Write a protein that binds this ligand. Structure first.
Ligand SMILES: [Mg+2]
Ligand SMILES: [Mg+2]
Ligand SMILES: [Mg+2]
Ligand SMILES: [Mg+2]
Ligand SMILES: [Mg+2]
Ligand SMILES: [Mg+2]
Ligand SMILES: [Mg+2]
Ligand SMILES: [Mg+2]
Ligand SMILES: [Mg+2]
Ligand SMILES: [Mg+2]
Ligand SMILES: [Mg+2]
Ligand SMILES: [Mg+2]
Ligand SMILES: [Mg+2]
Ligand SMILES: [Mg+2]
Ligand SMILES: [Mg+2]
Ligand SMILES: [Mg+2]
Ligand SMILES: [Mg+2]
Lengths: 182, 144, 53, 134
RNA sequence: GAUAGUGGCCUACCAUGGUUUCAACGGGUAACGGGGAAUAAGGGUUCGAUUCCGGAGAGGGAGCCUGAGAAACGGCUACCACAUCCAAGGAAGGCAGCAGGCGCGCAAAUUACCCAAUCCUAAUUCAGGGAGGUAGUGACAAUAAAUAACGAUACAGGGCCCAUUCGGGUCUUGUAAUUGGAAUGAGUACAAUGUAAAUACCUUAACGAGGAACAACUGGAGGGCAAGUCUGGUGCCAGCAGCCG
């Protein structure tokens, strides 16, 4: 009889399974951003949709009306923080025009790739999974982390691991050992 | 015009009329009369276990011709006798007389499948093990 | 027996020991390469599984 | 470098329990997990109070090492620590010693058995003896 | 009169009312009510045994004792139903508490550890608590995501300095049981956390990757509907096929 825990399904499947063009688009997207699943894409889409729902609702209310002024503004701020909206477009009307690419071009994946540190997206992903790459001296394991624009300045290798300068570890170490008494 | 009443105080008529009409919608009727419990061999349930009486080959409907390999089953829960199709090429010789079998529906919601006349049920599991598993040779039938 | 004859008849051909497919994100990458990177041999109507005959 | 930069954040002075309570934030660098005893010692050195008048509990590593966050209390005297601190914690520290109960089930059974007799069962014993005999 | 008190609540005398096509009454419910849940343009439709709030019930029906409070069932008395132990005189029962068993079935877990937390009870800081928590089982659902990453050489595609025929290939790509150093947790495991004591997590000494491993399955490839008129077998048979076939 303890208080229930809240779950939420964070993605939504397409309403039509084998829409070929759509499928191809999805594939292309995956290729672009080193996505393990269509599931990731779906998640992103769902997120976008949620935002859109909010925005539309806000629009439906009169402009300069309190609720719109507040909630909508907050949403806009959030978007700007995340780095999906640009400073030109703090508008709420522009929130509807966002599209899936802007969210994917903001993952700790893509960001990692686009700052050096990588050589292709797959490599970056591997690095992320492998516990290389820290943000604010905090090692991030998550490929789809959503880099918060002000933290984007701080993406670097960890103080642990090689690459960012510590003990080589595992394979290199083994090699060294082998070299040692020979 | 339009057959329905429209007036701001009609409401009741709209309700009652709708209720009356609803009975022409078959699914609704089924739900309300409770024909899933009173009739139907499965007691409104997704699956049922039964004991194999005998193995019967059934001749398919027209355009087609082939002996289908079904099984006459008597269900444990009520005692009603039903025909159940045994899917896949071998499989009929996995069954035998006096064997406990798990039957699902066919996939037509009470109606008969394809060309097999009077058969409304699949065979899923014999003596506790999946037919598919047996067929693919992933497990063996642990006698009866 | 009438039942299960065709299966009995068929020659028991064994699966060839192959190099394994790179499962996961790697697989997706491979697929992408096959389709939209290479764009190899395009007829106009771009085919997926062409017959070798 | 071992460093072990210890920090006492969120310091509430509590006269009602004769203690000082705080969030312990400790830095690692290159070293995994600080150990409680060491932390306690450090706290004692910091605060001048005795090592047994210090209590530290509920630690978690930052993820990816580097830091550990936990909770710390420093009592005014050892006596105070003894008479306010939970028994388990004391035992862990090394001050108080383990209470030796049987498994609770056994205790329950014993209680039930006891319930079944009215008064101290010396007369009962005698009855069992004599009656058993004849 | 009775009750804590109001009242046909019951009793005496009297009156003939009360409800109803704006469904009374009766019947059914595979009906506990609600908060809510699933779906999701707007309107709706279906579900709500179940974590909170009400209400009922402790096999069925009665009847009561004690008490501020019970018509209580981990109180009692009886009957009916089912059942134990017996030296046959008698005696004890009530898991819709937790664990567990049998049965029923399409359908559901350990006869585990503890009051440390949450709260509750008592004469009470102390004792008690299968309330509750903690692990065990658990692909109910839900979140995050490993199953490789970057190189060289070796055959092809693409930009082309110029296209007397070449070709260098200056630049970019894919493909080879070619080959190369790097990276890693999945595991293990000193420790230290964690914890009531432990697991596990998070942190980490030590081990831990080269194809035969540290191997991804589940379904499909006529159409609907993404994907073959490839190669064997079968020959209106075996079978497939939700539908057309
Ligand atoms: Mg590390
Ligand atoms: Mg009911
Ligand atoms: Mg209901
Ligand atoms: Mg309910
Ligand atoms: Mg029920
Ligand atoms: Mg019962
Ligand atoms: Mg009772
Ligand atoms: Mg009981
Ligand atoms: Mg009770
Ligand atoms: Mg139980
Ligand atoms: Mg289940
Ligand atoms: Mg419980
Ligand atoms: Mg398990
Ligand atoms: Mg397959
Ligand atoms: Mg098939
Ligand atoms: Mg085939
Ligand atoms: Mg097609």
């Amino acid at each position: 009889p303890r208080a229930p825990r809240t779950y939420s399904k964070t993605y939504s499947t397409p309403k039509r399974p084998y829409e070929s063009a759509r499928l191809d688009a999805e594939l292309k997207l995956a290729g672009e951003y080193g996505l393990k699943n269509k599931r990731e894409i779906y998640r992103i889409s769902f997120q976008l949709s949620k935002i859109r729902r909010a925005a539309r609702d806000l629009l439906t209310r009169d402009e300069k009306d309190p609720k719109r002024l507040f909630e909508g503004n907050a949403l806009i701020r959030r978007l700007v923080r995340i780095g999906v909206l640009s400073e030109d477009k703090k508008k709420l009307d522009y929130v509807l025009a966002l599209k899936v690419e802007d969210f994917l071009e903001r993952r700790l994946q893509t960001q990692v790739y686009k700052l050096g540190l990588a050589k292709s997206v797959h490599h970056a992903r591997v690095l992320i999974s492998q516990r290389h790459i820290a943000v604010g001296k905090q090692i991030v394991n998550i490929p789809s982390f959503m880099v918060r624009l002000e933290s984007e300045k701080h993406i670097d290798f960890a103080r642990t691991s090689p690459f960012g300068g510590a003990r080589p570890g595992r394979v290199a170490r083994k090699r060294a050992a082998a070299a040692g008494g020979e | 015009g339009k057959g329905k009443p429209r007036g701001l105080n009609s409401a009741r008529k709209l309700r009652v009329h709708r209720r009356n009409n609803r009975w022409a919608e078959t699914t609704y009727k089924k739900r309300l009369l409770g024909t899933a419990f009173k009739s139907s061999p499965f007691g409104g349930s997704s699956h049922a276990k039964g004991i194999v009486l005998e193995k019967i080959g059934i001749e398919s409907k027209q355009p087609n011709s082939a002996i289908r390999k079904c099984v006459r089953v008597q269900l444990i829960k009520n005692g009603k006798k039903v025909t159940a199709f045994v899917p896949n090429d071998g499989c009929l010789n996995f069954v035998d007389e006096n064997d406990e079998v798990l039957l699902a529906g066919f996939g037509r919601k009470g109606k008969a499948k394809g060309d097999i006349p009077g058969v409304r049920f699949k065979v899923v599991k014999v003596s506790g093990v999946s037919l598919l598993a047996l067929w693919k040779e992933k497990k063996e039938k642990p006698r009866s | 027996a009438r039942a299960g004859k065709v299966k009995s008849q068929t020659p028991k051909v064994e699966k060839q020991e192959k190099p394994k497919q790179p499962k996961g994100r790697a697989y997706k990458r491979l697929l992408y390469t096959r389709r939209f990177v290479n764009v190899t041999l395009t007829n106009g109507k771009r085919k997926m599984n062409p017959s070798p005959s | 470098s071992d460093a072990i930069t210890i920090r006492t954040r969120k310091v509430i002075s509590n006269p009602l329990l004769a203690r000082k309570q705080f969030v312990v934030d400790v830095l690692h660098p290159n070293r995994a997990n600080v150990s409680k005893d060491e932390l306690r010692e450090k706290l004692a050195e910091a605060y001048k109070a005795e090592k047994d008048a210090v209590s530290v509990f509920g630690f978690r590593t930052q993820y990816g090492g580097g830091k550990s966050t936990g909770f710390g209390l420093v009592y005014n005297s050892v006596a105070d620590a003894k008479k306010f601190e939970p028994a388990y914690r004391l035992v862990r520290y090394g001050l108080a010693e383990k209470v030796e109960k049987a498994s609770r089930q056994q205790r329950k059974q014993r209680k039930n058995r006891g319930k079944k007799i009215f008064g101290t069962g010396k007369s009962i014993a005698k009855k069992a003896a004599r009656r058993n005999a004849d």
